[PDB]
Write an enzyme that holds these catalytic residues in place. Sequence first.
Site: not given
Length: 448
Positions: A51, A135, A174, A177, A200
Amino acid sequence: TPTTFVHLFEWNWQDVAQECEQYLGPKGYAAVQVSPPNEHITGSQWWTRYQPVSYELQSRGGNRAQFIDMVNRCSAAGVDIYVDTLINHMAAGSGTGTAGNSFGNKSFPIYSPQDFHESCTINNSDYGNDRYRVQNCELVGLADLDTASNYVQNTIAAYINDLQAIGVKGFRFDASKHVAASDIQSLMAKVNGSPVVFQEVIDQGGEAVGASEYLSTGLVTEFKYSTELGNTFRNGSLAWLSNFGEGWGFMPSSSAVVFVDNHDNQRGHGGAGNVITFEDGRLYDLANVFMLAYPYGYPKVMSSYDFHGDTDAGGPNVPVHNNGNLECFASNWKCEHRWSYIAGGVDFRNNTADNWAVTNWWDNTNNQISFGRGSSGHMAINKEDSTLTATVQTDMASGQYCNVLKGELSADAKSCSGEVITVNSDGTINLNIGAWDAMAIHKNAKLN
Ligand SMILES: [Ca+2]
Ligand SMILES: [Cl-]
Protein backbone atom coordinates in the site's frame (compact mmCIF):
# COMPACT_ATOMS: atom_id res chain seq x y z
CA THR A 1 26.93 -19.46 -13.97
CA PRO A 2 24.14 -17.52 -12.16
CA THR A 3 20.78 -19.31 -12.64
CA THR A 4 18.71 -18.86 -9.46
CA PHE A 5 17.54 -15.85 -7.45
CA VAL A 6 16.02 -15.61 -3.93
CA HIS A 7 13.17 -13.72 -2.19
CA LEU A 8 14.52 -12.32 1.12
CA PHE A 9 11.00 -11.62 2.35
CA GLU A 10 10.87 -8.75 4.87
CA TRP A 11 14.68 -8.65 5.30
CA ASN A 12 16.03 -5.17 6.17
CA TRP A 13 18.76 -3.61 4.01
CA GLN A 14 21.58 -4.26 6.50
CA ASP A 15 20.81 -7.98 6.76
CA VAL A 16 20.62 -8.25 2.95
CA ALA A 17 23.96 -6.44 2.41
CA GLN A 18 25.69 -8.81 4.87
CA GLU A 19 23.89 -11.85 3.46
CA CYS A 20 25.21 -10.98 -0.02
CA GLU A 21 28.81 -10.81 1.27
CA GLN A 22 28.92 -13.79 3.58
CA TYR A 23 26.63 -16.21 1.75
CA LEU A 24 24.70 -15.39 -1.49
CA GLY A 25 27.74 -14.35 -3.54
CA PRO A 26 30.11 -17.20 -2.47
CA LYS A 27 27.23 -19.68 -3.00
CA GLY A 28 26.33 -18.41 -6.47
CA TYR A 29 22.81 -16.96 -6.12
CA ALA A 30 22.19 -14.57 -9.02
CA ALA A 31 20.04 -11.95 -7.36
CA VAL A 32 17.81 -10.95 -4.50
CA GLN A 33 14.17 -9.88 -4.72
CA VAL A 34 13.70 -7.33 -1.92
CA SER A 35 10.47 -6.18 -0.31
CA PRO A 36 9.01 -2.83 -1.55
CA PRO A 37 11.58 -0.10 -0.68
CA ASN A 38 9.26 2.87 -1.21
CA GLU A 39 7.18 4.73 1.36
CA HIS A 40 4.16 2.73 2.54
CA ILE A 41 1.51 2.89 5.28
CA THR A 42 2.46 2.47 8.96
CA GLY A 43 1.63 -0.76 10.81
CA SER A 44 3.33 -4.06 11.56
CA GLN A 45 1.54 -6.38 9.08
CA TRP A 46 3.65 -7.66 6.17
CA TRP A 47 1.06 -6.45 3.64
CA THR A 48 1.48 -2.77 4.62
CA ARG A 49 4.39 -2.93 2.13
CA TYR A 50 1.81 -3.32 -0.67
CA GLN A 51 0.00 0.00 0.00
CA PRO A 52 2.22 2.85 -1.31
CA VAL A 53 2.14 6.47 -0.10
CA SER A 54 4.96 7.89 -2.23
CA TYR A 55 8.08 6.78 -4.10
CA GLU A 56 10.58 7.96 -1.48
CA LEU A 57 13.00 5.22 -0.40
CA GLN A 58 12.06 5.25 3.32
CA SER A 59 10.45 1.97 4.40
CA ARG A 60 10.34 -0.70 7.06
CA GLY A 61 13.49 -2.10 5.44
CA GLY A 62 15.50 1.07 6.05
CA ASN A 63 16.34 4.49 4.61
CA ARG A 64 17.69 5.68 1.24
CA ALA A 65 21.34 5.61 2.34
CA GLN A 66 21.01 2.06 3.71
CA PHE A 67 19.24 1.02 0.50
CA ILE A 68 22.00 2.46 -1.71
CA ASP A 69 24.63 0.84 0.54
CA MET A 70 22.90 -2.56 0.13
CA VAL A 71 22.88 -2.25 -3.69
CA ASN A 72 26.60 -1.38 -3.74
CA ARG A 73 27.71 -4.17 -1.41
CA CYS A 74 25.58 -6.86 -3.11
CA SER A 75 26.85 -5.68 -6.52
CA ALA A 76 30.51 -5.93 -5.33
CA ALA A 77 29.72 -9.47 -4.15
CA GLY A 78 28.30 -10.27 -7.62
CA VAL A 79 24.60 -10.38 -6.65
CA ASP A 80 21.89 -8.25 -8.38
CA ILE A 81 18.92 -6.55 -6.72
CA TYR A 82 15.35 -6.88 -8.09
CA VAL A 83 12.87 -4.33 -6.70
CA ASP A 84 9.20 -5.22 -6.04
CA THR A 85 7.42 -2.38 -7.91
CA LEU A 86 3.74 -1.43 -7.35
CA ILE A 87 2.44 -0.41 -10.79
CA ASN A 88 -1.30 -0.91 -10.17
CA HIS A 89 -2.31 1.02 -7.05
CA MET A 90 -1.73 3.27 -4.04
CA ALA A 91 -2.88 2.88 -0.41
CA ALA A 92 -6.53 2.57 0.64
CA GLY A 93 -8.33 5.10 2.88
CA SER A 94 -6.11 7.55 4.77
CA GLY A 95 -3.26 7.88 7.24
CA THR A 96 0.50 8.46 7.37
CA GLY A 97 3.42 6.87 5.57
CA THR A 98 6.82 5.69 6.76
CA ALA A 99 8.49 8.96 5.62
CA GLY A 100 5.94 11.22 7.32
CA ASN A 101 3.75 11.95 4.30
CA SER A 102 -0.02 12.13 4.72
CA PHE A 103 -2.65 10.81 2.34
CA GLY A 104 -6.42 10.44 2.14
CA ASN A 105 -9.40 10.35 -0.23
CA LYS A 106 -7.25 9.35 -3.23
CA SER A 107 -4.94 12.30 -2.53
CA PHE A 108 -1.23 11.57 -2.22
CA PRO A 109 1.95 13.64 -2.40
CA ILE A 110 2.42 12.58 -6.06
CA TYR A 111 -1.15 11.82 -7.22
CA SER A 112 -4.52 13.61 -7.24
CA PRO A 113 -7.98 11.98 -7.28
CA GLN A 114 -8.02 12.50 -11.08
CA ASP A 115 -5.01 10.22 -11.49
CA PHE A 116 -7.07 7.16 -10.55
CA HIS A 117 -9.93 5.27 -12.15
CA GLU A 118 -13.39 5.91 -10.67
CA SER A 119 -14.07 3.62 -7.70
CA CYS A 120 -15.66 0.20 -8.18
CA THR A 121 -15.00 -3.16 -6.51
CA ILE A 122 -13.45 -6.18 -8.20
CA ASN A 123 -15.77 -9.14 -7.47
CA ASN A 124 -14.46 -12.72 -7.62
CA SER A 125 -16.72 -13.56 -10.59
CA ASP A 126 -15.18 -10.62 -12.51
CA TYR A 127 -11.96 -12.60 -13.06
CA GLY A 128 -13.78 -15.14 -15.21
CA ASN A 129 -15.96 -12.80 -17.25
CA ASP A 130 -15.09 -9.06 -17.08
CA ARG A 131 -11.56 -7.94 -17.97
CA TYR A 132 -12.70 -4.32 -17.76
CA ARG A 133 -13.61 -4.64 -14.06
CA VAL A 134 -10.44 -6.66 -13.34
CA GLN A 135 -8.23 -3.90 -14.79
CA ASN A 136 -10.20 -0.76 -13.91
CA CYS A 137 -11.75 -1.51 -10.53
CA GLU A 138 -10.16 -1.72 -7.09
CA LEU A 139 -8.26 -4.73 -5.74
CA VAL A 140 -9.49 -4.99 -2.12
CA GLY A 141 -10.11 -1.22 -1.91
CA LEU A 142 -6.65 -0.18 -3.12
CA ALA A 143 -6.83 3.09 -5.11
CA ASP A 144 -6.58 2.00 -8.77
CA LEU A 145 -4.14 4.15 -10.77
CA ASP A 146 -5.07 5.35 -14.24
CA THR A 147 -2.18 3.53 -15.93
CA ALA A 148 -3.21 4.89 -19.35
CA SER A 149 -2.43 8.44 -18.22
CA ASN A 150 0.80 10.02 -19.51
CA TYR A 151 1.32 11.62 -16.10
CA VAL A 152 0.97 8.32 -14.21
CA GLN A 153 3.27 6.54 -16.66
CA ASN A 154 6.00 9.25 -16.42
CA THR A 155 5.83 9.13 -12.62
CA ILE A 156 6.29 5.35 -12.32
CA ALA A 157 8.92 5.33 -15.10
CA ALA A 158 10.87 8.10 -13.30
CA TYR A 159 10.94 5.93 -10.13
CA ILE A 160 12.14 2.85 -12.07
CA ASN A 161 14.84 4.91 -13.85
CA ASP A 162 16.12 6.40 -10.58
CA LEU A 163 16.47 2.88 -9.16
CA GLN A 164 18.45 1.85 -12.23
CA ALA A 165 20.79 4.87 -11.77
CA ILE A 166 21.42 3.64 -8.21
CA GLY A 167 22.28 0.21 -9.62
CA VAL A 168 19.08 -1.87 -9.35
CA LYS A 169 19.11 -4.44 -12.19
CA GLY A 170 15.57 -5.78 -12.17
CA PHE A 171 11.94 -5.27 -11.25
CA ARG A 172 8.97 -7.36 -10.18
CA PHE A 173 5.77 -5.73 -11.46
CA ASP A 174 3.26 -6.44 -8.71
CA ALA A 175 -0.39 -7.08 -9.67
CA SER A 176 0.27 -7.00 -13.42
CA LYS A 177 -3.00 -8.80 -14.25
CA HIS A 178 -4.82 -5.70 -13.02
CA VAL A 179 -3.11 -3.49 -15.59
CA ALA A 180 -3.75 -3.71 -19.33
CA ALA A 181 -0.79 -5.25 -21.16
CA SER A 182 -0.95 -2.21 -23.49
CA ASP A 183 -0.53 0.18 -20.52
CA ILE A 184 2.60 -1.78 -19.52
CA GLN A 185 3.96 -1.61 -23.09
CA SER A 186 3.55 2.21 -23.02
CA LEU A 187 5.24 2.32 -19.61
CA MET A 188 8.23 0.27 -20.85
CA ALA A 189 8.71 2.72 -23.74
CA LYS A 190 9.63 5.22 -21.01
CA VAL A 191 12.04 2.91 -19.13
CA ASN A 192 15.81 3.33 -19.87
CA GLY A 193 17.58 0.37 -21.43
CA SER A 194 16.31 -3.13 -20.82
CA PRO A 195 16.35 -4.24 -17.17
CA VAL A 196 15.19 -7.70 -16.06
CA VAL A 197 11.41 -7.49 -15.58
CA PHE A 198 9.08 -10.21 -14.33
CA GLN A 199 5.32 -9.75 -14.03
CA GLU A 200 3.07 -11.25 -11.38
CA VAL A 201 0.11 -12.75 -13.20
CA ILE A 202 -1.85 -15.53 -11.49
CA ASP A 203 -3.39 -17.66 -14.24
CA GLN A 204 -4.58 -21.21 -13.51
CA GLY A 205 -6.99 -21.20 -16.47
CA GLY A 206 -10.50 -19.89 -17.12
CA GLU A 207 -9.56 -16.23 -16.59
CA ALA A 208 -10.75 -13.31 -18.73
CA VAL A 209 -7.17 -11.91 -18.55
CA GLY A 210 -4.49 -14.46 -19.48
CA ALA A 211 -0.79 -14.78 -18.60
CA SER A 212 0.11 -15.05 -22.30
CA GLU A 213 -0.88 -11.41 -22.79
CA TYR A 214 2.24 -10.33 -20.87
CA LEU A 215 4.86 -12.39 -22.71
CA SER A 216 6.05 -9.44 -24.82
CA THR A 217 6.76 -7.12 -21.89
CA GLY A 218 8.98 -9.49 -19.87
CA LEU A 219 9.02 -12.71 -17.85
CA VAL A 220 5.79 -13.93 -16.24
CA THR A 221 5.30 -15.85 -12.99
CA GLU A 222 4.01 -19.33 -13.88
CA PHE A 223 1.72 -20.16 -10.93
CA LYS A 224 0.68 -23.52 -12.44
CA TYR A 225 4.21 -24.75 -11.64
CA SER A 226 3.90 -24.15 -7.89
CA THR A 227 0.42 -25.71 -7.76
CA GLU A 228 1.14 -28.76 -9.93
CA LEU A 229 4.53 -29.50 -8.37
CA GLY A 230 2.97 -29.36 -4.91
CA ASN A 231 0.04 -31.48 -6.00
CA THR A 232 2.24 -34.15 -7.59
CA PHE A 233 4.66 -34.41 -4.64
CA ARG A 234 1.79 -34.70 -2.15
CA ASN A 235 -0.89 -36.60 -4.04
CA GLY A 236 0.57 -38.00 -7.25
CA SER A 237 3.48 -39.90 -8.73
CA LEU A 238 6.88 -38.34 -9.38
CA ALA A 239 7.00 -40.45 -12.56
CA TRP A 240 4.43 -38.01 -14.06
CA LEU A 241 7.04 -35.22 -14.07
CA SER A 242 9.02 -36.72 -17.00
CA ASN A 243 7.53 -34.06 -19.31
CA PHE A 244 6.84 -31.27 -16.76
CA GLY A 245 6.68 -27.82 -18.40
CA GLU A 246 5.15 -26.89 -21.78
CA GLY A 247 3.92 -30.49 -22.02
CA TRP A 248 1.60 -29.87 -19.04
CA GLY A 249 0.38 -26.66 -20.66
CA PHE A 250 2.73 -24.16 -18.92
CA MET A 251 4.07 -21.06 -20.73
CA PRO A 252 7.43 -21.21 -22.59
CA SER A 253 10.43 -22.06 -20.35
CA SER A 254 12.35 -18.94 -21.41
CA SER A 255 9.44 -16.71 -20.29
CA ALA A 256 8.64 -18.26 -16.90
CA VAL A 257 9.62 -17.38 -13.35
CA VAL A 258 8.95 -20.49 -11.20
CA PHE A 259 8.94 -21.44 -7.50
CA VAL A 260 7.83 -24.08 -4.95
CA ASP A 261 6.09 -21.31 -3.00
CA ASN A 262 6.04 -17.55 -2.70
CA HIS A 263 5.07 -15.06 0.05
CA ASP A 264 1.37 -14.96 -0.96
CA ASN A 265 0.66 -18.63 -1.62
CA GLN A 266 2.42 -19.88 1.51
CA ARG A 267 -0.32 -17.87 3.28
CA GLY A 268 -3.27 -19.16 1.21
CA HIS A 269 -3.49 -16.26 -1.26
CA GLY A 270 -3.40 -17.73 -4.77
CA GLY A 271 -2.60 -21.23 -3.61
CA ALA A 272 -4.33 -23.95 -1.61
CA GLY A 273 -3.02 -26.42 1.00
CA ASN A 274 -1.23 -28.53 -1.61
CA VAL A 275 1.47 -25.86 -1.92
CA ILE A 276 4.65 -27.10 -0.26
CA THR A 277 6.33 -24.73 2.28
CA PHE A 278 9.15 -24.73 4.91
CA GLU A 279 6.65 -26.24 7.36
CA ASP A 280 6.78 -29.47 5.39
CA GLY A 281 10.47 -29.96 6.15
CA ARG A 282 12.02 -32.77 4.09
CA LEU A 283 9.07 -32.59 1.62
CA TYR A 284 10.16 -28.99 0.91
CA ASP A 285 13.79 -30.13 0.52
CA LEU A 286 12.82 -32.70 -2.13
CA ALA A 287 10.49 -30.36 -4.08
CA ASN A 288 13.27 -27.70 -4.29
CA VAL A 289 15.76 -30.35 -5.38
CA PHE A 290 13.49 -31.28 -8.30
CA MET A 291 12.82 -27.67 -9.34
CA LEU A 292 16.53 -26.70 -9.19
CA ALA A 293 17.67 -29.79 -11.09
CA TYR A 294 14.87 -29.64 -13.75
CA PRO A 295 15.56 -27.35 -16.74
CA TYR A 296 12.34 -25.33 -16.85
CA GLY A 297 12.03 -21.63 -16.00
CA TYR A 298 14.05 -19.18 -13.91
CA PRO A 299 13.64 -20.31 -10.28
CA LYS A 300 13.46 -18.19 -7.17
CA VAL A 301 14.13 -19.79 -3.81
CA MET A 302 11.78 -18.58 -1.06
CA SER A 303 13.26 -17.28 2.25
CA SER A 304 10.69 -17.02 5.04
CA TYR A 305 10.04 -16.39 8.70
CA ASP A 306 7.94 -18.59 11.00
CA PHE A 307 4.60 -16.73 11.20
CA HIS A 308 3.10 -19.20 13.70
CA GLY A 309 -0.10 -19.62 11.72
CA ASP A 310 -0.80 -15.84 11.77
CA THR A 311 -1.16 -14.95 8.05
CA ASP A 312 -1.19 -11.18 8.71
CA ALA A 313 1.85 -11.08 10.98
CA GLY A 314 4.98 -9.15 10.08
CA GLY A 315 8.52 -10.50 10.51
CA PRO A 316 10.70 -11.26 13.60
CA ASN A 317 11.71 -8.55 16.10
CA VAL A 318 15.33 -9.57 15.76
CA PRO A 319 17.76 -9.11 12.83
CA VAL A 320 19.24 -12.08 10.97
CA HIS A 321 22.80 -11.01 11.75
CA ASN A 322 22.45 -10.30 15.47
CA ASN A 323 25.75 -9.46 17.30
CA GLY A 324 27.75 -12.27 15.69
CA ASN A 325 24.80 -14.65 16.05
CA LEU A 326 22.78 -15.92 13.05
CA GLU A 327 19.03 -15.96 13.78
CA CYS A 328 18.29 -18.75 11.29
CA PHE A 329 16.64 -22.18 11.26
CA ALA A 330 14.45 -21.81 14.36
CA SER A 331 11.32 -19.83 15.30
CA ASN A 332 12.44 -16.52 13.68
CA TRP A 333 13.93 -16.42 10.16
CA LYS A 334 13.83 -19.90 8.50
CA CYS A 335 16.60 -19.12 5.97
CA GLU A 336 15.64 -21.83 3.46
CA HIS A 337 18.22 -20.48 1.01
CA ARG A 338 20.83 -21.87 3.49
CA TRP A 339 19.30 -25.34 3.89
CA SER A 340 21.79 -27.96 2.72
CA TYR A 341 19.54 -29.54 0.03
CA ILE A 342 18.43 -26.18 -1.33
CA ALA A 343 21.88 -24.50 -1.60
CA GLY A 344 23.19 -27.80 -3.03
CA GLY A 345 20.40 -27.65 -5.64
CA VAL A 346 21.44 -24.12 -6.61
CA ASP A 347 25.04 -25.30 -6.94
CA PHE A 348 23.78 -28.11 -9.20
CA ARG A 349 21.78 -25.74 -11.47
CA ASN A 350 24.77 -23.38 -11.75
CA ASN A 351 27.08 -26.20 -12.86
CA THR A 352 24.80 -27.88 -15.42
CA ALA A 353 23.82 -24.65 -17.24
CA ASP A 354 25.69 -25.80 -20.35
CA ASN A 355 23.25 -28.66 -21.02
CA TRP A 356 19.53 -27.85 -20.64
CA ALA A 357 18.20 -31.25 -21.68
CA VAL A 358 16.79 -34.00 -19.48
CA THR A 359 18.74 -37.16 -20.33
CA ASN A 360 18.33 -40.81 -19.34
CA TRP A 361 15.08 -40.35 -17.39
CA TRP A 362 14.37 -43.28 -15.09
CA ASP A 363 11.54 -44.01 -12.65
CA ASN A 364 9.93 -46.96 -10.87
CA THR A 365 6.48 -45.89 -12.28
CA ASN A 366 5.76 -44.12 -9.00
CA ASN A 367 7.85 -42.17 -6.45
CA GLN A 368 11.46 -42.89 -7.43
CA ILE A 369 13.07 -40.91 -10.27
CA SER A 370 16.52 -40.18 -11.66
CA PHE A 371 17.73 -38.15 -14.61
CA GLY A 372 20.75 -36.36 -15.96
CA ARG A 373 21.77 -33.10 -17.58
CA GLY A 374 24.02 -34.92 -20.04
CA SER A 375 27.61 -35.28 -18.86
CA SER A 376 27.36 -32.18 -16.64
CA GLY A 377 25.41 -33.84 -13.83
CA HIS A 378 22.98 -36.45 -12.55
CA MET A 379 20.47 -36.70 -9.71
CA ALA A 380 17.93 -39.01 -8.07
CA ILE A 381 15.01 -38.62 -5.63
CA ASN A 382 13.55 -41.45 -3.52
CA LYS A 383 10.14 -40.60 -2.15
CA GLU A 384 9.14 -44.22 -1.40
CA ASP A 385 9.29 -45.96 2.02
CA SER A 386 12.11 -48.35 1.05
CA THR A 387 15.67 -47.86 -0.17
CA LEU A 388 16.28 -46.94 -3.79
CA THR A 389 18.99 -49.39 -4.91
CA ALA A 390 18.55 -49.42 -8.69
CA THR A 391 21.44 -49.15 -11.13
CA VAL A 392 20.94 -46.13 -13.38
CA GLN A 393 22.70 -45.08 -16.57
CA THR A 394 24.47 -41.68 -16.77
CA ASP A 395 26.63 -39.75 -19.27
CA MET A 396 29.20 -38.84 -16.64
CA ALA A 397 32.91 -39.60 -16.53
CA SER A 398 33.79 -42.43 -14.16
CA GLY A 399 35.23 -41.48 -10.79
CA GLN A 400 34.18 -40.20 -7.36
CA TYR A 401 31.87 -37.26 -6.75
CA CYS A 402 30.49 -35.37 -3.73
CA ASN A 403 26.72 -35.65 -3.22
CA VAL A 404 26.38 -31.83 -3.24
CA LEU A 405 23.05 -32.02 -1.40
CA LYS A 406 24.92 -33.29 1.70
CA GLY A 407 28.31 -31.59 1.45
CA GLU A 408 30.90 -30.04 -0.81
CA LEU A 409 34.29 -30.54 -2.40
CA SER A 410 37.24 -29.22 -0.37
CA ALA A 411 39.47 -26.41 -1.69
CA ASP A 412 42.16 -28.88 -2.80
CA ALA A 413 39.56 -31.23 -4.36
CA LYS A 414 40.86 -34.18 -2.32
CA SER A 415 37.79 -34.77 -0.13
CA CYS A 416 34.07 -34.08 0.35
CA SER A 417 32.28 -33.11 3.55
CA GLY A 418 29.33 -35.43 2.85
CA GLU A 419 28.85 -38.81 1.15
CA VAL A 420 30.68 -39.88 -2.00
CA ILE A 421 28.91 -41.16 -5.13
CA THR A 422 30.69 -43.49 -7.52
CA VAL A 423 30.21 -43.44 -11.28
CA ASN A 424 31.41 -46.86 -12.58
CA SER A 425 33.55 -47.29 -15.73
CA ASP A 426 30.41 -47.89 -17.80
CA GLY A 427 28.81 -44.62 -16.63
CA THR A 428 26.39 -46.28 -14.21
CA ILE A 429 25.70 -45.48 -10.54
CA ASN A 430 24.58 -48.18 -8.08
CA LEU A 431 22.16 -46.06 -6.07
CA ASN A 432 21.78 -46.34 -2.29
CA ILE A 433 19.28 -43.70 -1.17
CA GLY A 434 17.15 -44.05 1.94
CA ALA A 435 13.45 -43.21 2.11
CA TRP A 436 12.74 -39.50 1.48
CA ASP A 437 16.27 -38.63 0.46
CA ALA A 438 18.14 -37.59 -2.71
CA MET A 439 21.49 -37.28 -4.42
CA ALA A 440 22.91 -34.84 -6.99
CA ILE A 441 26.36 -34.84 -8.56
CA HIS A 442 27.94 -32.53 -11.11
CA LYS A 443 31.16 -32.40 -13.15
CA ASN A 444 32.71 -29.64 -11.03
CA ALA A 445 32.54 -31.55 -7.71
CA LYS A 446 34.64 -34.53 -8.79
CA LEU A 447 37.29 -35.93 -6.42
CA ASN A 448 41.12 -35.94 -6.52
CA1 LIG B 1 -5.78 -1.41 -12.47
CL1 LIG C 1 5.96 -13.62 -7.24
